[PDB]
Amino acid sequence: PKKRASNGRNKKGRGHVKPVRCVNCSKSIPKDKAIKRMAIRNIVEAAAVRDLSEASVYPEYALPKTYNKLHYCVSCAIHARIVRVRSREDRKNR
Amino acid sequence: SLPATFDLTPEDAQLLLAANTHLGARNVQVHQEPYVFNARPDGVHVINVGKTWEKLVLAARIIAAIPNPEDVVAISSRTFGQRAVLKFAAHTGATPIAGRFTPGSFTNYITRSFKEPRLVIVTDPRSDAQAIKEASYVNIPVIALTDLDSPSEFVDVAIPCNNRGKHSIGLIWYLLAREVLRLRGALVDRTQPWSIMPDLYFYRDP
Amino acid sequence: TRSSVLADALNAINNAEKTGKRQVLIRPSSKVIIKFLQVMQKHGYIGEFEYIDDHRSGKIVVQLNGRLNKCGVISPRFNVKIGDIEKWTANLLPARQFGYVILTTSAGIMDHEEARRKHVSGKILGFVY
Amino acid sequence: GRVRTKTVKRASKALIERYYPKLTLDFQTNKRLCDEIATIQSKRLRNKIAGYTTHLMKRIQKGPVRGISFKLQEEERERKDQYVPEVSALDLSRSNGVLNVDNQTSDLVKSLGLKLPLSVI
Amino acid sequence: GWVPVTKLGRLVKAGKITTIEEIFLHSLPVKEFQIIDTLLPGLQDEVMNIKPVQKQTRAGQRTRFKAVVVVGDSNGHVGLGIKTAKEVAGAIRAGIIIAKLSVIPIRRGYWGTNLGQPHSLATKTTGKCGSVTVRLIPAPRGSGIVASPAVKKLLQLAGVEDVYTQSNGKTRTLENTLKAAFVAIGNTYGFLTPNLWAEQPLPVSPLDIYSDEASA
Amino acid sequence: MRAKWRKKRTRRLKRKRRKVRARSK
Amino acid sequence: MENDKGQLVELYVPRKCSATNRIIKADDHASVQINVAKVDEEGRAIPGEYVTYALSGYVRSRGESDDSLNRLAQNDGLLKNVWSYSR
RNA sequence: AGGGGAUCGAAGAUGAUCAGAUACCGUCGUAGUCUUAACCAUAAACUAUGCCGACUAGGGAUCGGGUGGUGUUUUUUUAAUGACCCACUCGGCACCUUACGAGAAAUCAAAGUCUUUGGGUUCUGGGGGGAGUAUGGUCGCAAGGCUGAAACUUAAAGGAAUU
């Protein structure tokens, strides 16, 4: 039977959308069907900022930040544990 | 008819306005309450204090119409108007249902918490929707102190009042306990000010 | 598109009854519904209704008192003999004590009960009960 | 695993609702008092049941808890219901005897009760 | 021994309430089987059948008995109830206690000739429960109750001596048929006939006048 | 066993029998 | 409803809802009865007699039960200026 | 039939793994994936919900347009513009809570105004297989498309929730 009001993923009044490619398994997934997760982690690893600071030209003030978007297929999403099966009561939560 | 002495006197208008019983909710508004009169440009809506007082005694007239002055009960699930109801429960009889409401007090006759009322008052219908819903199966009239953003279902007496405020809820509870005592005749003269103050109904922060 | 003005209008008061309306706005504004409420009001079945007239079709506002349950119109205007008046009464309306099969003849619009008193059969309009 | 079970919990609340001045805050004086009015057929069982009620007298000395009703909680409830504030009566006070209201409020006052104090800020 | 705990139990035990029409007219909340038996002594019990039901689990089955029992005198009071229990005796004894609790009056009239006592229904009535609906058509005298054997004996004790019955859907589901008829017979009073068309003063509830014979 | 395999077997059958008919007619 | 002899057969003629004239069912366990006292000059509420207000559970379902109570108090003269017939 | 022919890539050549692998995993690699002129007329071509017309509980957000409010800004504060705010309206993709109503439920403001059965109109199905097959016509260079059975066989298949 039907599982979601928005059947696949919010494909309503459109009919077709340009598919894209996943970044792990390279699956052809529609634009709105592929989940997009922001990657706003800094260019440096967790903490360790002062370690580069002591060997940093200028009084630092650089703080570069890397931004990226991740396209994941459904199979890779469950495998990466980012999105997990929710209860029927939970399923109506955005 | 009425003796026309039930007008909103300056002293009753002074405590109603100073307690902020006229301010309403935001742009969200249920179209089942045509009691609204204009709004603040910032977003605060304004209710007619005249209609709130007018329909207050209408609720009071139906509360005191019950012969036995102990069958009346009131629900306060939200801890905000907790001690207000005990003042009602201490002045003109009644049994407190303050604090937690047992789910089955209305229908089940075996539970030790089984009462049977003929008329119920609630503060926030959203906060205690269980009370009105359960009471709907025993065909009992109810009273609600709704606000322009609260639903008005399964209620035949809905008091328009502010629910987000100590000065408002405590004062409106104090009033509806005042004329019912006056209408019952325990205060004799209507023009004589009461010796009890709404701040007793107020809830202390500690 | 608009096919039967009476059918579209009559459904609104029926929907009005279902929600308990004492008033409803009807706006095909024709004669064939005007005499529909003339005979309808004759037996005190509804209240006092209002007709709005202007340069175009117009509007109907009816003050209905909440005493009705279900009213309908039978589409293809069937040709009914005198021998089928009692046939239509059994399968459409609760009994012969009440319920009036409104139908029009060459003499005008008037219910089934006095129609068999007329001993003339005409054109079926609907049923009121 | 010192958590008590249901039978001791339900039995414990049965005493204090009518035995407030007998459940002394000392365990030794009421560890055998319960046997005199509660028929317990076990020396071991009668100890923890006396222990639990004694435990609540310790906390009830500090303050009240939920759903107990020991015939004196209502006594303080009917005492703490007449606070009757003397002068801060939220009327003819908290201001210069006049409401601090808005311009739009003036329309509500003059609708039917114009004869009243007013001060639009 | 009764020692009633509810309000309606005290009035009947005191003799204030005589006939059952007062409770039906005022529609007071009543869940006590003592009142119904005392009000109408002449009630007959009937059970259609028993359909076993088992709870599938880790191992084995523990089949219960689900007994549907209808009880009603053939003069205008009938009631229906459904209950499940492990043993047959408990299931049937609980079916009566709830069916008698749910006694519903029926409006009796004619197919329409207006000489004698009521025989059949005034209007056609139906009620959809599950996927089956039953129709009750007024019938000339002498036709009898034509219906399914379970339904026809249900209407035999309803007091109506004849009715024409139409059924739709899977009528094999017996328990769905009576509840469809159970809501149908109650709906029968929900039809606004041109006879009950004058307005009458609304009576005062008997609980208010007899307030002192209530509680305490 | 899947639907397109039913269809592929049937189409193969039509091709063989069409070859047979062409060899005959 | 009447036979030829004269006796009125069939029992418990049901009440009529005050706001909208619908039949209140015996199984309809949502119909409320409202009784309002009367004032006699001095402002004291005399007991014993009330104006009877029968409201069906259909009215209460939509929440307009408060709305319906206005006109019958207004029409009976109990209320003065609450609900204006013209919205 | 040409142009084009970088990546990927039905076939295939291969390397693992497996008892077997002509599959899943890696590397090359033809047709193809791009375009021109002409055919092919198919799909989970789905909102699995035909179109037209009226009525029916509410709330907010969002696209386009319009109206009014010395509304707030935007210069040469100001004349207008432009962005917004407030209030309303029309046409929309539609959401959120409820169920008078329907539904077998999953649920639906339409899947409601269907037993109280009727607004108008087109098309499709009568147990499951056989079989969307045989044959006959018909479009197509073909692959294929449209129409479309029968014999025979079975008492079970199928839909919705539960432990």
UniProtKB/Swiss-Prot annotation, chain A:
Q: Where is this region: Disordered?
A: 1-19
Protein keywords:
Cytoplasm, Ribonucleoprotein, Ribosomal protein
> Where found in the cell?
Cytoplasm
For this record, the Gene Ontology CC terms, alphabetical, are: 90S preribosome; cytosol; cytosolic small ribosomal subunit
What is an annotated GO biological process for this record, any one?
Answer: cytoplasmic translation
What's one GO MF term for it? structural constituent of ribosome
Indicate the principal place this protein occupies in or around the cell: cytoplasm
Other known facts: Present with 16300 molecules/cell in log phase SD medium.
**Record's function text:** Component of the ribosome, a large ribonucleoprotein complex responsible for the synthesis of proteins in the cell. The small ribosomal subunit (SSU) binds messenger RNAs (mRNAs) and translates the encoded message by selecting cognate aminoacyl-transfer RNA (tRNA) molecules. The large subunit (LSU) contains the ribosomal catalytic site termed the peptidyl transferase center (PTC), which catalyzes the formation of peptide bonds, thereby polymerizing the amino acids delivered by tRNAs into a polypeptide chain.
Family indicated by similarity: Belongs to the eukaryotic ribosomal protein eS26 family.
This protein's name? Small ribosomal subunit protein eS26A
- The record's gene field reads RPS26A
Covered range within the whole protein? 2 to 95 of 119
UniProtKB/Swiss-Prot annotation, chain C:
Say if the entry is tagged with keyword Ribonucleoprotein: yes
Q: Name one GO biological process term.
A: cytoplasmic translation
Where can this protein be found?
Answer: Cytoplasm
Instruction: Tell me where on the tree of life, at the top rank, the source sits.
Output: Eukaryota
Q: Signal peptide: which range, if any?
A: none
Q: Which family does it belong to?
A: Belongs to the universal ribosomal protein uS8 family.
Q: How does it assemble?
A: Component of the small ribosomal subunit (SSU). Mature yeast ribosomes consist of a small (40S) and a large (60S) subunit. The 40S small subunit contains 1 molecule of ribosomal RNA (18S rRNA) and 33 different proteins (encoded by 57 genes). The large 60S subunit contains 3 rRNA molecules (25S, 5.8S and 5S rRNA) and 46 different proteins (encoded by 81 genes).
| Miscellaneous remark of the record | Present with 40400 molecules/cell in log phase SD medium.
The name under which this protein is listed is Small ribosomal subunit protein uS8A
What is the organism of origin for this protein? Saccharomyces cerevisiae (strain ATCC 204508 / S288c)
Q: Which gene encodes it?
A: RPS22A
Curated annotation (Swiss-Prot), chain E:
**Entry comment on modification after translation:** N-terminally acetylated by acetyltransferase NatA.
- Output the superkingdom of the source species: Eukaryota
Query: Is RNA-binding among the key words of this record?
Result: no
Query: Mind telling me which Gene3D superfamilies this protein's record contains?
Result: 3.30.160.20, 3.30.230.10
* Residue span, S5 DRBM domain: 43-106
Localization terms from the record: Cytoplasm; Nucleus, Nucleolus
Any one Gene Ontology molecular-function term assigned to this protein's record: small ribosomal subunit rRNA binding
Q: Name one GO biological process term.
A: rRNA processing
Per the record's keyword annotation, is Disulfide bond included, yes or no? no
One GO cellular component assignment for this chain's record is: nucleoplasm
Q: Which keywords describe this protein according to UniProt?
A: Acetylation, Cytoplasm, Isopeptide bond, Methylation, Nucleus, Ribonucleoprotein, Ribosomal protein, Ribosome biogenesis, rRNA processing, Ubl conjugation
One Pfam family cited in the UniProt record for this chain: Ribosomal_S5_C
How the protein assembles, per its UniProt entry? Component of the small ribosomal subunit (SSU). Mature yeast ribosomes consist of a small (40S) and a large (60S) subunit. The 40S small subunit contains 1 molecule of ribosomal RNA (18S rRNA) and 33 different proteins (encoded by 57 genes). The large 60S subunit contains 3 rRNA molecules (25S, 5.8S and 5S rRNA) and 46 different proteins (encoded by 81 genes). Interacts with snoRNA U3. Interacts with MPP10. Component of the ribosomal small subunit (SSU) processome composed of at least 40 protein subunits and snoRNA U3.
User: What's the family?
Assistant: Belongs to the universal ribosomal protein uS5 family.
Q: Can you name this protein?
A: Small ribosomal subunit protein uS5
Native species:
Saccharomyces cerevisiae (strain ATCC 204508 / S288c) (Baker's yeast)
This protein's encoding gene: RPS2
UniProtKB/Swiss-Prot annotation, chain G:
Q: What does the record note as the disruption phenotype of the gene behind this chain? A: Reduction in growth rate, a decrease in free 40S subunits, an increase in the amount of free 60S subunits and a decrease in polysome size.
Major localisation = cytoplasm
Q: Which UniProt keywords apply?
A: Acetylation, Cytoplasm, Ribonucleoprotein, Ribosomal protein, rRNA processing
> Which GO molecular function annotation, any one, does this entry have?
structural constituent of ribosome
Q: Which InterPro entries match?
A: Ribosomal_eS21 (IPR001931), Ribosomal_eS21_CS (IPR018279), Ribosomal_eS21_sf (IPR038579)
Identify residues that carry N-acetylmethionine.
1
Q: Which GO terms describe its cellular component?
A: cytosol; cytosolic small ribosomal subunit
* PTM per Swiss-Prot/TrEMBL: N-terminally acetylated by acetyltransferase NatB.
Keyword Ribosomal protein assigned: yes
User: Which domain of life does this protein belong to?
Assistant: Eukaryota
Q: Name one Pfam family in it.
A: Ribosomal_S21e
- UniProt GO BP: endonucleolytic cleavage in ITS1 to separate SSU-rRNA from 5.8S rRNA and LSU-rRNA from tricistronic rRNA transcript (SSU-rRNA, 5.8S rRNA, LSU-rRNA); endonucleolytic cleavage to generate mature 3'-end of SSU-rRNA from (SSU-rRNA, 5.8S rRNA, LSU-rRNA); translation
- Subcellular localization: Cytoplasm
User: What does the subunit comment say?
Assistant: Component of the small ribosomal subunit (SSU). Mature yeast ribosomes consist of a small (40S) and a large (60S) subunit. The 40S small subunit contains 1 molecule of ribosomal RNA (18S rRNA) and 33 different proteins (encoded by 57 genes). The large 60S subunit contains 3 rRNA molecules (25S, 5.8S and 5S rRNA) and 46 different proteins (encoded by 81 genes).
Additional note from the record: Present with 27400 molecules/cell in log phase SD medium.
Which family does the similarity line name? Belongs to the eukaryotic ribosomal protein eS21 family.
* Protein's name according to its UniProt entry: Small ribosomal subunit protein eS21A
